[PDB]
Structures are given as C-alpha cells and as structure tokens.
Amino acid sequence: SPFFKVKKLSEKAVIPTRGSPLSAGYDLSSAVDSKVPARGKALIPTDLSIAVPEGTYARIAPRSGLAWKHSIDVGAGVIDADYRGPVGVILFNHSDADFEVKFGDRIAQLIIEKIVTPDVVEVDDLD
Amino acid sequence: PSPFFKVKKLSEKAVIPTRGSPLSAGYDLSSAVDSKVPARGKALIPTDLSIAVPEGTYARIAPRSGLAWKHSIDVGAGVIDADYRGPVGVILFNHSDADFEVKFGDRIAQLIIEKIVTPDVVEVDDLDET
Amino acid sequence: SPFFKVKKLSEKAVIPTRGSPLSAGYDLSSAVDSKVPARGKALIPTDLSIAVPEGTYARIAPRSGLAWKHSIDVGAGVIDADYRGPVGVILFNHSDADFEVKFGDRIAQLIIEKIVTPDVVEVDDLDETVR
Ligand SMILES: [Mg+2]
C-alpha cells in the first residue's frame, strides 16, 4: 500500500501538500532565504527527510510558475526510496537576473513515480 | 477503469497529439503558433489544446531528443496535473547562443502519461534505517 | 513481468548497475573521454543498446553529484521501449567551467518509469474540474 512518510528536521519545515485534488505532486517549501545567482545555482534545504515505497521514487519536479516567471528550473531530483538524508532542491537560474528564494517559498513539487527495477539481462540480440 | 487520453482543440491550429512508434513513450506535441525561443532565454509555446488524463497519472511535457542536441532546447517545466483543464503550453528553455525558430505545426515536445501514486502525507517522528 | 535487456556495442561499454536495493536508477558510464564545454553541450556515447517492456520507457536522468558539483544536467533522455539504436547521453553545462568526462565515468542514471499509452481521442468538450 502506497505511503508518503515525512520527518521534520527543524521547526522551519513545512509538511508538503498537494495543490489540487488530482494533482501529481506535493509542494515543497524552502526552509531558508537564499540567492539564486544569474546563470548560476543554489541548493535549497526543505529541512525534511522522507520515505516512499519500493517500486517508486520521489522525483523533485519543477513548478511551472518558477520556470516561466523566473527562468528557474530543477536539477538532479532523483530521490531513491531508501534515501533517508535531508531533501534539498537544486535550482538552476537560466537568466541574467539574480533571483532570491524567500523562507517558505514553494520551490518544487515532489512526485512519487512508479518504476520497475528488474535485474539486467545482457543479450547479443535485443529482440 | 481503463486509461484514457482526451484532447480538446481550442483552435483550428491545434494538432491531435500522436505517438511515434507502437511502444513509444509519448505523444508528439505540435506548435499552434509561429514563434521563437530566444538565445539563452525561454518561451511559452501554445498547443491550443486542453487535455484530460486519468487519476493516478500525470501528463509530463518532455523534451524531444533531436531538438535537445540540434538546438540545445529543453523543457523548463512540464508537470500537467490530471485535473488541469486549462490550455496546454510548452515552456522551452534555450541553452544555446542562437534563437530557435518555431513554425506552426512543428513538433516541439512530447507528452508522456506517467504512472504515479498519491498517498496521504503522514508526518512521522522516525524513519527506518537502510 | 518486467525486464531490462542490454546489448554491448563495444568492449568500452559497462552494464548499468543499481547502487542499493531500493535505488531508482541504473548508473550509466561514458564509453569515451570527452568534454562538456562551459555553457555548452555534448552527446556522450554509452555504447549500449537496450530494451525495456511495453508500458514503460527508460528515462536518462541526472546524477545529483554532477548537478551540484559541475552544474551538469541531462537533456532529452526519453528512450522508447522499442528504440534499438545506440544510447547516448546529452549533457548541458550550466556553468562557465568546462566539465571533463573520462572513459568509465558515471554520467547519468537510467530509470525505467511506468506509463500508460491509451489511444488518444479528440472530444468536443472536457469535464470541468474542482481545482
Ligand atoms: Mg518521470
């Protein structure tokens, strides 16, 4: 049975919520105030640790508003189901304008994507 | 219930998205406009479509491989919720020093209906060790 | 039942491996020495061809380390389940420093994501949603 368990690592953390009833993702909020330099990057802590089920992973996905309005998008973003460290969001600034993330800003959305993980079979012929 | 992909044309310029091979992941998205993605910049390209995909999925607007190598084009963000009924636009980022020209009808992205789970969020005191 | 078939196209190829029992991705290694130029791009060969099952595709996904240490992101990355050509990794460099790729370096990770591929139908109107 699917689950999404979240542990607050500080009092500043915001428990993720979905934005609409059928929404794909859980909104993630910044636990800090941080500059994202023009044509540069920032690593934004959520002060959360998580667990998601085997047969899935948590993808840190971009919010469309951040991307369209501010040319900000998300690098990396693959959180394994057994990763128990703090969840941070890597933002890339694809513009010549400096940007600033404020404490509590929603900076990404977490999507729990279904996957398969079979053992690899090496072959001489794929078909 | 069986999966579905319904599309509604918002103008005559919209093109029904079509897959590219019988096992292909995604449905090709065509531009409804003439436009451009400026060098080192971005654009929102209308498809003039509204869509519906099933609960337990979302529609991901994903980059085409050819455009990524030839024009350094990427999709800046492409999460479309299963309950999103607004117009579908494609956000393109141009990671090169030359403009990318868009003519109406041009394929600019592909849509992939990804399976997900959406359980309730549960705050906990401790997580298991791995 | 899911599978992941891999064919090596040369001796330089490395069978993709998963790091831990619950890891999402299979690490992909470069088959070449190469460079991703500052603010530029490169197509890095793996010298692999692959097959994944119907109802999935293989997503070429970024490694977190390369993203943060080198501003490297993966472009493109949608590998169809019936694509039988060579698998190359498209890297974008979002920094002003060249990124060197050495033979055997891990440059991405492959994730076999579950999808649906229903027959698309045009309709006159869609349901409006409480949103
Ligand atoms: Mg995905």
Author numbering:
A (entry chain C): 26 to 152
B (entry chain B): 25 to 154
C (entry chain A): 26 to 156
Sentences copied from the publication:
Deoxyuridine triphosphate nucleotidohydrolase (dUTPase; EC 3.6.1.23) is an important enzyme that prevents uracil misincorporation during de novo DNA synthesis. Homo-trimeric dUTPases have three active sites, each of which consists of five conserved motifs.
In the apo Arabidopsis dUTPase, taurine was an indispensable additive for the growth of single crystals. These are likely due to crystal-packing induced hydrophobic interactions with proline 46 in neighboring subunits.
